[PDB]
Amino acid sequence: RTTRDDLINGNSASCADVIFIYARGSTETGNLGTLGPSIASNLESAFGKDGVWIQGVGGAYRATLGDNFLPRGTSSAAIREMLGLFQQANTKCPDATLIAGGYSQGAALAAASIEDLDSAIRDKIAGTVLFGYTKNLQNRGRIPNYPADRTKVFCNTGDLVCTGSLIVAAPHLAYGPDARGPAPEFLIEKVRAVRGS
């Protein structure tokens, strides 16, 4: 449920049309955590199990408490891992549309990875959703080097990490409805738009 390695376990002979790469928050289990499974279920509904590959960022991304305090909100190894998956997706399935997402530390991670991402693969990222984006204030609600029309940030009122703090209040753990509704809806919308549908 909370771990999905569709990409790693993915066969180039049987590529999916859409590949979703998601990064969990600090301390979350699996490679998807609490919000990932919700987003995954909706994409599967719109693209069928065979149409989309769900891949969480595991491996070197340990989703450590201390890494939130590093300059970019996460570690260099974590950024390397996610970068590595965008590259694996582009190699195995050059025609698949890419979409991404992250929550809390995973949000800062998604943002750093996309920022460091080679233009070409980045251009393939139809849309990205970020919940409780820890660098929201610092990056002005954007992902550096990634267009605003493709970025959607879910930052609750009262969520202190969205306004420059590294402290958690109730609003930070209240993204469940966003992950079950608005978030996958935005992702499905952008994918359809790029593939035409």
Residues 11 and 14: their CA atoms lie apart, in Å, by: 5
Which residues contact residue 145 at a Cβ distance below 8 angstroms, ignoring those fewer than 6 apart?
114, 115, 117, 122
Note if 159 is an active site residue.
yes
Note if 5 is an active site residue.
no
Going from the C-alpha of 165 to that of each of 16, 22, 72, 84, the distances in angstroms are 39, 23, 14, 29
The two three-digit tokens of residue 176, written as one number: 């469940």
Residues 77 and 99: their CA atoms lie apart, in Å, by: 21
The two three-digit tokens of residue 41, written as one number: 């279920």
End-to-end Cα spacing for the chain: 28
List 153's β-bridge partners, or say none. Answer: 130
Note if 172 is an active site residue.
yes
The reported resolution of this PDB entry, expressed in Å, is: 2.0
Residues 133 and 172: their CA atoms lie apart, in Å, by: 10
Which is the catalytic residue, given 38, 75, 159, 178? 159
Phi and psi dihedrals of 181, rounded to 5?
-125, -90
Which is the catalytic residue, given 38, 104, 113, 178? 104
The structure's method of determination equals X-ray
User: Which fold does the domain 1-197 belong to in CATH?
Assistant: Rossmann fold (3.40.50)
Which residues contact residue 91 at a Cβ distance below 8 angstroms, ignoring those fewer than 6 apart?
none
Is the separation of the CB atoms in 75 and 102 below 8 Å? no
Q: Is 103 exposed, middle or buried (0-12, 13-18, 19+ CB in 10 A)?
A: buried
